Design a protein around this nucleic acid. Structure first.
Ligand SMILES: [Mg+2]
Ligand SMILES: [Mg+2]
Ligand SMILES: [Mg+2]
Ligand SMILES: [Mg+2]
Ligand SMILES: [Mg+2]
Ligand SMILES: [Mg+2]
Ligand SMILES: [Mg+2]
Ligand SMILES: [Mg+2]
Ligand SMILES: [Mg+2]
Lengths: 287, 250, 81, 68, 66, 97, 95, 87
RNA sequence: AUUAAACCUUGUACCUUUUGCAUAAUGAACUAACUAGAAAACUUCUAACUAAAAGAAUUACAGCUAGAAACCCCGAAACCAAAC
């Protein structure tokens, strides 16, 4: 624009002409002068001028406020409670529209992470993502998605458009590998197995109404229909759909990645995969 | 045969490109041999001199370590005993001959040990500074795009006279694509000159551009610089260090 | 200035030079290796993991031996550790 | 003048000297050996069979799994 | 800022920043009942307005087709 | 006060010696070099403060961790005494609580 | 408190605060009432009801409690089935 | 010995002042000192007094007989006096 | 001020501390050199990018990253260990 024309007229830019942005630096004040010297802002002789006032929270000898209030367990066990990041249907629809997630293929945590759709902190006790009903009315996509937790209304929205949603469990060690797979391959170790849910979480993941990954497949057809009746839509049949194979794809309950089995080694340097030939090893991984 | 170059990357529709004369160094009079186009987003950014101030100061300060040191009253030799008793003497009260008040005593508030001044500016900010510096040289007519650095003779005097002939500055910075393949003739001529400096493309920095009056870029380096800087725009944040494998990044 | 080597490695360095080097190999091995004595004055942990009662979580455990003083008279007899 | 060659990271697998007293200990573990194969593939020379657990290690892994 | 001062910001402006200020004042003036208070930053090429008017401005800019 | 009775000998500075001419080169090694090296690795100095900064108490504790076991007896005695003095100042004294 | 610790050079949390109060992400703090388990036989039915409640803290108490805890206790927590999910935010507040 | 040359530079100026007071310099005519052009000075002389002079006449007035003697003595190793105008 | 150095007119030494007051009471023979405010949790200002920011581990219902902005000196009677 016109600004660059000004440069042509003005003298050369050099190390003798530099200037900071105005107001970017304040002035630091030393106690030399009369305004800021003498008593130097500390007051008259006492404990505070000399520099030895009591600590924060001390009230002069009466029992302090933060210790006269009774103890109660608001934060008991906080470091052991499980955490799930929320993913709303507004956010999911937004991501598909801009092309940062590919709806043709199945969607799992790895694909969500790779598109910056979600940020996962395993060291802060994140165990995965839960689908949230907000934005359900305007969801107009057909997809295959796997999440750790789901809500009643969120499941309805996905399926009404002819899609599949399922709930799956990952352990702390597996979750770290899932989010950042490439650094694991650089280590040179075999892929580990996936542990089953703790005892308390077994009822949730073996229940059809939750779309669990360990529930009886025979009972799914009944559950899907009842949602259609309750929320007033017609249950579509996906077997007719051309993409039935994609929508039906599901991984083994002891598998982390779709096309890879426990016990394999990924040699990324020369694009090869190594498999063990020992019966004891094969039996261990397959169990 | 005019040498005409086009930007490999997509220029924004609303921005017209900018151009400069291609030149050669083989002769004293081969000033113009071609016409070239330069991406507007690199060579036509807004003229921000505050950012140029920041990057120049970062370069000078992030390396600094000061080795100034002084002894406190604890580390000076001797001084353990109380010199005289509190009362009777009629002198001032004192407890050690190595306090700051005494000649030969310790320093109350002096420099302490080796100290570092390290800090890092955000990567996008440092990349922006390079674009602004390249823009400034072009708009002020201190940039000269050249096809190659080949020279007829290795005599240092020839290069100096050429700079006088073409109205260059007293100090010239010359950039070539890579260190290993730099032409033999150029290396011999520059090595004996204080003010004419030859560096590879990866060594370009804001501080050297300010120090040297005129910049000289070979055409292959222009494509090199354009690629790296424009990548900083339209990228994600890093999931992990970029040196690790990525789908589409070297 | 600083020493070239850490202090705790000085003993190994001495055995590596001089007439100490000329000693036979396996006897130098006996001096080098240090093995912890069997517990006598404390009870070792049976397991490597235990359930902390207060919070009910699995915790790692270690065995830290008691320091014991051996008077020089002990070298003239056979005390059972 | 001419600037010196740009600094470059050393390429290829790295095998530290075991006897040297000043080699850091962490570089001498089996984990470090495994990393070399992961970064550099076959050029490392690490026997690929070593990457998997040995039979004695396997028994310990299985024993712990049953317990917990 | 300060916990009580609400503002809206239009950031990546190229060309004549002053022309945009005049259009924004005309567009927003009838709603407020007064001319809006604004700041123009020529160096950074941004425009700052007192009060929250993000939704109206977003729709307004789409109509112009930017 | 007393002042010099003669002018000191002149100081002559060469602004185009090798160190001054090539200052700054390779400060962009990462962005222009595909990020194989971080610019901090170009720094020369004490082992315990390469690419790091801290206050005096932090510097003292960091120095002990890196080279504490390779120090002379008397130097180590002074370093330990400095740490305890700085600990009591920063945790018990000052205007602001 | 410890402004600069020897081993890490960081501030330290006062753990007696963490055992007595709850912090909502907006900046409010919750507590119980002193004496809510003591000598209930001599307290009226209205007095006992007031004691059972969860109560908020004043501005000066909130300021002090913030200084005595580190940032980790001030982050966003996404607990499934949280019974305080609806109290972490403010609505219709002009201030 | 303090670092720096600026204090040493300042003190040289004061030593110059002290020397002048004790040993005042002999007088010198302004022509010897810098910033002198004879032609320009003469013209300003007339204009200063708001009177117009003929340059050839005015210059002759300043010349003196004793001046001629000195120049010729130096010359050995034309002009014209102001005697007529004086009378 | 003055023609004029002194004469005439006007004028209760300095720092600290006390009740905002000293003819009170501490301190100072004079010269030269030396001799005492230091840290970034929160806030404000200046920039980069922006539903995302950061060169790995962190924060986020406009945020996030970087810069700048801060908290003195001298002085006991004692207590303990090991020598003489
Ligand atoms: Mg200060
Ligand atoms: Mg988080
Ligand atoms: Mg001492
Ligand atoms: Mg003593
Ligand atoms: Mg003392
Ligand atoms: Mg000294
Ligand atoms: Mg008295
Ligand atoms: Mg006196
Ligand atoms: Mg003095």
């Amino acid at each position: 624009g016109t600004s660059l024309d000004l440069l042509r007229s003005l003298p050369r830019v050099s190390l003798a002409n530099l200037k900071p942005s105005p107001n970017s630096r304040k002035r630091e004040r030393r106690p030399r002068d009369r305004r800021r010297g003498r008593k130097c802002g500390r007051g008259h002789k006492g404990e505070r001028q000399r520099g030895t006032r009591p600590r924060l929270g001390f009230e002069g000898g009466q029992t302090p406020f933060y210790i006269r209030i009774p103890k109660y367990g608001f934060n008991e066990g906080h470091s052991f409670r499980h955490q799930y990041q929320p993913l709303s249907l507004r956010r999911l629809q937004y991501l598909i529209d801009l092309g940062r997630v590919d709806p043709t293929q199945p969607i799992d945590l790895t694909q969500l992470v790779n598109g910056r759709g979600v940020t996962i902190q395993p060291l802060k006790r994140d165990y995965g993502v839960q689908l949230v009903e907000e934005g359900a009315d305007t969801f107009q996509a057909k997809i295959n998605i796997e999440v750790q937790l789901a809500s009643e209304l969120a499941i309805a929205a996905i399926e009404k458009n002819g899609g599949v949603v399922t709930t799956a469990f990952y352990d702390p060690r597996s979750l770290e590998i899932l989010c950042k797979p490439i650094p694991f391959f650089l280590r040179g170790q075999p892929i580990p197995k996936r542990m089953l849910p703790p005892e308390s979480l077994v009822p949730y993941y073996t229940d059809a109404k939750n779309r669990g990954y360990l529930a009886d497949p025979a009972k799914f057809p009944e559950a899907r229909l009842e949602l259609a009746m309750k929320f007033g839509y017609v249950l579509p049949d996906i077997t007719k759909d051309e993409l039935f194979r994609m929508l039906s794809a599901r991984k083994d309950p002891r598998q982390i990645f779709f096309g890879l089995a426990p016990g394999w080694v990924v040699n990324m340097a020369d694009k090869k995969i190594l498999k063990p030939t020992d019966e004891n090893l094969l039996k261990y991984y397959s169990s | 045969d005019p040498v005409l170059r086009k930007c490999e990357l997509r220029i924004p529709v609303h921005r017209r490109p900018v151009q400069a004369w291609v030149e050669s160094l083989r002769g004293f009079e081969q000033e113009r041999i071609g016409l070239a186009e330069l991406h507007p987003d690199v060579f036509a950014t807004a003229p921000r001199l505050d950012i140029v101030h920041q990057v120049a100061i970062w370069q000078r300060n992030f390396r600094r370590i000061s080795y100034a040191n002084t002894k406190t009253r604890a580390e000076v030799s001797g001084g353990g005993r109380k010199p005289w008793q509190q009362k009777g003497s009629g002198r001032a009260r004192h407890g050690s001959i190595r306090s700051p008040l005494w000649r030969g005593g310790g320093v109350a508030h002096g420099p302490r040990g080796p100290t570092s001044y390290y800090y890092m500016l955000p990567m996008k900010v440092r990349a922006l500074g390079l674009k602004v510096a390249l823009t400034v040289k072009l708009m002020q007519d201190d940039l000269h795009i050249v096809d190659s650095l080949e020279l007829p003779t290795a005599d240092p005097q020839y290069l100096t006279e050429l700079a006088q002939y073409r109205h260059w500055g007293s100090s010239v910075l010359l950039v070539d694509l890579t260190h290993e393949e730099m032409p033999k003739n150029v290396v011999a001529a520059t090595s004996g000159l204080n003010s004419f400096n030859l560096i590879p493309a990866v060594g370009l920095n804001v501080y050297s551009m300010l120090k040297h009056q005129t910049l000289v870029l070979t055409l292959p380096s222009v494509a090199f610089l354009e690629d790296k800087l424009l990548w900083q725009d339209s990228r994600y944040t890093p999931l992990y260090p970029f040196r690790l494998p990525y789908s589409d990044f070297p | 200035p600083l020493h070239r080597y850490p202090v705790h490695l000085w003993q190994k360095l001495r055995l590596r030079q001089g007439i100490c080097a000329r000693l036979p190999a396996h006897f130098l091995r006996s001096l080098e290796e240090e093995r912890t004595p069997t517990p006598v004055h404390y009870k070792p942990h049976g397991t490597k993991f235990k359930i902390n009662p207060k919070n009910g979580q699995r915790e790692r455990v270690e065995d830290v031996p008691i320091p014991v003083h051996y008077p020089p008279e002990s070298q003239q007899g056979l005390w059972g550790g | 003048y001419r600037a010196p060659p740009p600094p470059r990271r050393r390429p290829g697998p790295h095998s530290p000297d075991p006897e040297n007293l000043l080699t850091p200990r962490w570089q001498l573990t089996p984990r470090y050996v495994a990393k070399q194969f992961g970064r550099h593939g076959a050029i490392s020379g690490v026997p690929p069979a070593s990457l998997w657990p040995t039979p004695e290690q396997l028994r310990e892994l299985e024993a712990e799994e049953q317990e917990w | 800022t300060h916990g009580n001062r609400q503002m809206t910001l239009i950031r990546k402006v190229e060309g004549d920043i002053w022309a945009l200020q005049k259009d924004v004042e005309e567009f927003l003036s009838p709603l407020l009942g007064k001319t809006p208070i604004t700041q123009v930053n020529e160096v950074t090429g941004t425009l700052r307005i007192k009060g929250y008017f993000d939704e109206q401005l977003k729709a307004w800019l789409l109509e112009k087709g930017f | 006060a007393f002042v010099r009775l003669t002018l000191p000998p002149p100081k002559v500075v060469d602004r185009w010696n090798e160190k001054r001419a090539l200052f700054g080169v390779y400060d962009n090694i990462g962005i222009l070099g595909n990020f194989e090296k971080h610019p901090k690795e170009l720094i020369k100095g004490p082992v315990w403060l390469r690419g790091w900064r801290g206050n005096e108490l932090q510097r003292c504790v960091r120095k002990k961790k890196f080279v504490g076991n390779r120090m002379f007896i008397e130097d180590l005695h002074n370093l330990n005494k400095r740490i305890s003095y700085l600990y009591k100042h920063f945790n018990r004294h000052g205007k602001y609580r | 408190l410890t402004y600069c610790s020897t081993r890490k050079g960081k501030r330290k949390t006062v753990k007696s605060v963490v055992h007595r109060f709850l912090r909502l992400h907006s900046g409010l703090w919750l507590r119980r009432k002193a004496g809510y388990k003591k000598k209930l036989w001599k307290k009226s039915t209205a007095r006992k009801k007031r004691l059972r409640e969860f109560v908020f803290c004043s501005k000066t108490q909130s300021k002090l409690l913030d200084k005595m805890t580190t940032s980790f206790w001030k982050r966003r927590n996404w607990y499934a089935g949280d019974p305080y999910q609806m109290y972490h935010d403010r609505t219709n507040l002009r201030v | 010995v303090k670092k720096g040359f600026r204090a040493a530079f300042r003190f040289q100026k004061e030593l110059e002042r002290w020397r002048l007071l004790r040993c005042p310099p002999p007088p010198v005519r302004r022509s010897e000192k810098p910033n002198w052009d004879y032609h320009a000075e003469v013209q300003a002389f007339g204009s200063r007094l708001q009177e117009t002079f003929s340059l050839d006449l005015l210059k002759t007035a300043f010349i003196n007989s004793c001046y001629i003697k000195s120049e010729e003595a130096k010359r050995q190793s034309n002009l014209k006096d102001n005697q007529e105008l004086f009378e």
